[PDB]
Design an enzyme around this catalytic site. Sequence first.
Site, PDB file in Angstrom:
ATOM      1  N   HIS A  39       0.714  -1.264   0.000  1.00  0.00           N
ATOM      2  CA  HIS A  39       0.000   0.000   0.000  1.00  0.00           C
ATOM      3  C   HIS A  39       0.749   1.326   0.000  1.00  0.00           C
ATOM      4  O   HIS A  39       0.201   2.308  -0.511  1.00  0.00           O
ATOM      5  CB  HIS A  39      -1.087  -0.069   1.100  1.00  0.00           C
ATOM      6  N   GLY A  77      -0.395   8.308   7.214  1.00  0.00           N
ATOM      7  CA  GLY A  77       1.021   8.651   7.205  1.00  0.00           C
ATOM      8  C   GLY A  77       1.850   7.805   8.176  1.00  0.00           C
ATOM      9  O   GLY A  77       3.087   7.900   8.227  1.00  0.00           O
ATOM     10  N   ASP A  92      -0.727  -6.976   3.097  1.00  0.00           N
ATOM     11  CA  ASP A  92      -0.359  -5.588   2.952  1.00  0.00           C
ATOM     12  C   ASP A  92       1.072  -5.333   3.416  1.00  0.00           C
ATOM     13  O   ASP A  92       1.334  -4.775   4.488  1.00  0.00           O
ATOM     14  CB  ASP A  92      -1.508  -4.866   3.674  1.00  0.00           C
ATOM     15  N   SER A 132       1.221   4.542   8.163  1.00  0.00           N
ATOM     16  CA  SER A 132       1.143   3.307   7.397  1.00  0.00           C
ATOM     17  C   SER A 132       2.494   2.758   6.985  1.00  0.00           C
ATOM     18  O   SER A 132       3.432   3.529   6.761  1.00  0.00           O
ATOM     19  CB  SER A 132       0.254   3.549   6.189  1.00  0.00           C
ATOM     20  N   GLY A 133       2.663   1.453   6.938  1.00  0.00           N
ATOM     21  CA  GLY A 133       3.965   0.932   6.629  1.00  0.00           C
ATOM     22  C   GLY A 133       4.816   0.835   7.875  1.00  0.00           C
ATOM     23  O   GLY A 133       5.738   0.027   7.885  1.00  0.00           O
TER      24      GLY A 133
END
Length: 240
Positions: free
Chosen positions: A45, A186, A93, A188-189
Amino acid sequence: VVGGTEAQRNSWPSQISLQYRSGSSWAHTCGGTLIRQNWVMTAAHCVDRELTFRVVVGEHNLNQNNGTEQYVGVQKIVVHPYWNTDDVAAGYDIALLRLAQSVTLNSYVQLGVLPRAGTILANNSPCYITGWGLTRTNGQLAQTLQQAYLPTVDYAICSSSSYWGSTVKNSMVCAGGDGVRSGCQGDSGGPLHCLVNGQYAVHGVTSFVSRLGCNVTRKPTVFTRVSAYISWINNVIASN
Ligand SMILES: CC(C)C[C@H](NC(=O)C(F)(F)F)C(=O)N[C@@H](C)C(=O)Nc1ccc(C(F)(F)F)cc1
Ligand SMILES: [Ca+2]
């Protein structure tokens, strides 16, 4: 991270910024975990748009020069083969980024520790979410790395009708849920750090919050549960 506290310069040193070039300049999009000297785990993503990306190790304050940053360009983006872009709820993901250089290890730039495969956290496991993401629903990204205490809600509770239902899988960790703290856009990851036999291991990669807002009661933050994906990680690093 909504409901956070500024972390210290060296509390979380595997934490990188994924930045994409923005015409003239670079911009924060997502977090990640430096898992080898030249490999960053993040979300599939994050690396979903065709944009030029750099990784920043040693980052604490985005907007200001800390004396600790190393900026290294992303060489290769390997996304999970099974990740479908139009369905976060299927899971998968997760993406590994091979960096153009290997980075210098020092007190601000260290490897994040990975769980053992199969490892399920128990309902309530002490975990910290770290990131530069939004500090309010519809708010603004943080200048300085933030943390919030985000304790795990297990599969059984998280998949009941009241919380997530079928949206969450067992390939997934939901930490939080209390109306006050969670991830947000923001982060995310980024890494979920949880305490296991005296070490902070990275157990989740930040995936999603409700469509309705970040800090929502009975909607925890959902993370790709890293221990499911260990062999895939090892294989992509072994053959690439
Ligand atoms: C969808 C992705 C770009 C992830 C994005 N995640 C984040 O902002 C982060 F960092 F908290 F992980 C998000 O949750 N955004 C909200 C606004 C969203 O669309 N949430 C969401 C999307 C799909 C579902 C599902 F799977 F049920 F369709 C549920 C919630
Ligand atoms: Ca900076």
